[PDB]
Design a binder for this molecule. Structure first.
Ligand code: CCH
Length: 291
C-alpha cells in the first residue's frame, strides 16, 4: 500500500487559505456549542481520530482516504460525538467541493488549534478519497482505562516515541469528556478553548483523587473540579513520561514546538509526498489577515 499525495487539480495555497478562513469564521460564529466551549476542541479530536487508525505495519488507515465518511468508521464507538464535528464541516465542504475529505478533516484540526491560539502547524494537501472498501475496522483507537505501558505500546503503532506521545497528549487541555460519549465526565482544566500547557500544570499541581464515575469507570478527580483519565494519569506514573511532563509544565514554548511537529507528523502518517509536491503551507489566522 502506497498513498501518494496528489494535489487537488489546479489548486494553490490561496485556495487552501480560503477553506481555512471559512472554517475559522464559522468557529467564531458558532460559539454556543457545548456550553460555550466552541467547536475548536471537537475538530481537533476529529483530525486526530481520522489519523489514529493508521497502522505502520501495513499502511492501512491514517488520514489519506477520508474513510471517516463511511458508516463503518463513522459509527465506531470510539468515535462517539465526532458527528458534531462532521456536521460542522459539512457546509464548508459544500462551499468547497473540490477539497478532498481527508484534506478537510485534517485541515479543521489545524484551523482549530491555530485559531485557539495554539502554535502554527504546517499542513500539506494531497489526500485522496478512497473507496468504502478501504475503511479500517473499528478497534484501532486507544482505550482510556489503561496505563503507561499500554500507551507506549499503542503509540508505537503510529511511530510515535515518548516525546511525541507526551506532546500529543497536551491536547487534553482542550474541551472535555462527556459521559454520554465516552463514559467519562468533566474537563481537564479551566481554559478549555484556548491552547496552553495547562494540562501539564494541572497534572502536576492538583491533588487528584481516584474515584468511580456515574458510568462506573475510574477517573482522577481534582478539588478544582477537573478530571484526568487513567491514561492521562499514567503520564506521571512513568518515569520517562514524567520528566517530559515537567519540561512542558515549565516551558510552553518547548511544548508548542514539539506539539506542532508531532501533530503534523500524526496527520501525515501513511502518506508519500512526491519530490515535486509543494512545500507545506503555513496558514495565516483570521487575526493575521485582519478578518
Ligand atoms: C492531539 C489530539 C489528542 C490526543 C492525541 C488524544 C489522545 C487520547 N484521548 Fe483525547 N481528545 C482530544 C484530543 C486528543 N486526545 C480532544 C481535544 C478532546 C476533547 C473533545 C471535546 O471536548 O469534545 C478529546 C477527548 C477525549 C475523550 C473524551 C470523549 C467525550 O467527548 O466523552 C476521551 C475519552 C479521550 C481519550 C483519549 C485517549 C485514550 C487518548 C490517547 O491515549 N480523548
Amino acid at each position: 500500500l502506497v498513498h501518494v499525495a496528489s494535489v487537488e487539480k489546479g489548486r494553490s495555497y490561496e485556495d487552501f487559505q480560503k477553506v481555512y478562513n471559512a472554517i475559522a469564521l464559522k468557529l467564531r460564529e458558532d460559539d454556543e456549542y457545548d456550553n460555550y466551549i466552541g467547536y475548536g476542541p471537537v475538530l481537533v479530536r476529529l483530525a486526530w481520530h481520522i489519523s489514529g487508525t493508521w497502522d505502520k505495519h501495513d499502511n492501512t488507515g491514517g488520514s489519506y482516504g477520508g474513510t471517516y465518511r463511511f458508516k463503518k468508521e463513522f459509527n465506531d464507538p470510539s468515535n462517539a460525538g465526532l458527528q458534531n464535528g462532521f456536521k460542522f464541516l459539512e457546509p464548508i465542504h459544500k462551499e468547497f467541493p473540490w477539497i478532498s475529505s481527508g484534506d478537510l478533516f485534517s485541515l479543521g484540526g489545524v484551523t482549530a488549534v491555530q485559531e485557539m491560539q495554539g502554535p502554527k502547524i504546517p499542513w500539506r494537501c494531497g489526500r485522496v478519497d478512497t473507496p468504502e472498501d478501504t475503511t479500517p475496522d473499528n478497534g484501532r483507537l486507544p482505550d482510556a482505562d489503561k496505563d503507561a505501558g499500554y500507551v507506549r505500546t499503542f503509540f508505537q503503532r503510529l511511530n510515535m516515541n515518548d516525546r511525541e506521545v507526551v506532546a500529543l497528549m497536551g491536547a487534553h487541555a482542550l474541551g472535555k469528556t462527556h459521559l454520554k460519549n465516552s463514559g467519562y465526565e468533566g474537563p481537564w482544566g479551566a481554559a478549555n478553548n484556548v491552547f496552553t500547557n495547562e494540562f501539564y500544570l494541572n497534572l502536576l499541581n492538583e491533588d487528584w483523587k481516584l474515584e468511580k464515575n456515574d458510568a462506573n469507570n475510574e477517573q482522577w478527580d481534582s478539588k478544582s473540579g477537573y478530571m484526568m483519565l487513567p491514561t492521562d494519569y499514567s503520564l506521571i506514573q512513568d518515569p520517562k513520561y514524567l520528566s517530559i511532563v515537567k519540561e512542558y509544565a515549565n516551558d510552553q514554548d518547548k511544548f508548542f514546538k514539539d506539539f506542532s511537529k508531532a501533530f503534523e507528523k500524526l496527520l501525515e502518517d501513511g502518506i508519500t509526498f512526491p519530490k515535486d509536491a509543494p512545500s507545506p503551507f503555513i496558514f495565516k489566522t483570521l487575526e493575521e489577515q485582519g478578518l
